[PDB]
Design a binder for this molecule. Structure first.
Ligand SMILES: [Ca+2]
Ligand SMILES: [Ca+2]
Ligand SMILES: [Ca+2]
Ligand SMILES: [Ca+2]
Ligand SMILES: [Ca+2]
Ligand SMILES: [Ca+2]
Ligand SMILES: [Ca+2]
Ligand SMILES: [Ca+2]
Ligand SMILES: [Ca+2]
Ligand SMILES: [Ca+2]
Length: 313
């Protein structure tokens, strides 16, 4: 009572107040604090062990204490537990000891992912798309969050948007930038609940195809001698030719304008075409073009022209 051991209790306050050690805290010094309660005493020594490293301090007259420790020791501490002990002394030279522990959480980074969808439906920017607004869209994952910033620089132009509630994102980009920059980085940046910044990135690539390729179109003789007689002019004449090369394909439309009249047919599997024409039209119009309309897989279109002349008797 004057000769008895002192009975005390040792408490450690939550580490950095929120019980969480983040990257910035880990990279500096941290103040741990607590109280010694119980019997009255006139001084004391608190010993803390963290990551095998001992820290020590005094206890204040009001029973509190506080000590600077390496964030790196807290971050490295294998079980995320601070071990603590105290010895105190009173005026009569009685002493007392106690122990305590304090667990904490270490969260020094987070992971964020991002993906980017295809650039238009086929991941190809065609001629028409290159003169339009094209949607660039994607989603973010892992620790990335609604409200995060999504950015990309495309042909030197910075485009920005924000992650939506469902973690998708999209932003309108000019076709002409996409026509000129077929590979770029997209990033998502933000901050986790412990305050650590994070960044995720991905590379979007696409191809640019803004033209289809003309082939070769020919027109055969207009009848066997390339001359329209009175008799042939009275009837129907089969006008024929070829259409091959470039993007010309079976099924392509062949268009002929003769004497103000429009005639059409399609290219066949041999690369030939034939169409029935009124003789009266060929009689009035001694020269005309055959025009084949083609397209490539990107959806660009192109006209291939063959020109014809004949005589009339
Ligand atoms: Ca903290
Ligand atoms: Ca420990
Ligand atoms: Ca792509
Ligand atoms: Ca496309
Ligand atoms: Ca680029
Ligand atoms: Ca956040
Ligand atoms: Ca093409
Ligand atoms: Ca003839
Ligand atoms: Ca003509
Ligand atoms: Ca001819």
């Amino acid at each position: 009572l004057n000769q008895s051991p002192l009975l005390i209790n040792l408490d450690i306050d939550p580490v950095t107040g929120d019980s969480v050690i983040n990257a910035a805290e880990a990279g500096g010094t941290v103040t741990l604090t607590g109280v010694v309660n119980g019997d009255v005493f006139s001084s004391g020594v608190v010993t803390l062990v963290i990551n095998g490293v001992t820290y020590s301090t005094n206890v204040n007259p009001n029973g509190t204490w506080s000590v600077s420790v390496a964030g790196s020791d807290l971050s490295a501490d294998s079980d995320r537990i601070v071990d603590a002990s105290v010895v105190v002394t009173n005026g009569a030279g009685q002493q007392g000891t106690a122990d305590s522990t304090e667990s904490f959480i270490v969260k020094t980074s987070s992971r964020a992912t991002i993906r980017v969808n295809s650039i238009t439906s086929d991941d190809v920017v065609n001629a028409e798309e290159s003169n339009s607004t094209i949607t660039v869209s994607g989603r973010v994952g892992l620790d990335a969050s609604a409200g995060d910033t999504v950015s990309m620089t495309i042909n030197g132009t910075l485009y920005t948007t924000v992650v939506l509630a469902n973690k998708t994102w999209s932003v309108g980009v000019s076709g002409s930038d996409l026509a000129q920059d077929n590979s770029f980085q997209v990033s998502v940046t933000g901050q986790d609940s412990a305050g650590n910044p994070y960044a995720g990135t991905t590379t979007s690539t696409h191809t640019v195809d803004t033209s289809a390729d003309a082939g070769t179109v020919t027109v055969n003789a207009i009848t066997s001698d390339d001359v329209i007689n009175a008799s042939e002019a009275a009837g129907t004449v089969a006008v024929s030719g070829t259409a091959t090369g470039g993007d010309i394909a079976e099924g392509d439309t062949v268009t002929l304008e003769i004497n103000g009249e429009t005639y059409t047919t399609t290219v066949d599997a041999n690369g030939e075409w034939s169409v029935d024409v009124a003789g009266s039209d060929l009689a009035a119009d001694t020269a005309f073009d055959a025009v084949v309309t083609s397209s490539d897989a990107a959806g660009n279109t192109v006209d291939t022209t063959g020109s014809s002349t004949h005589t009339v008797d």
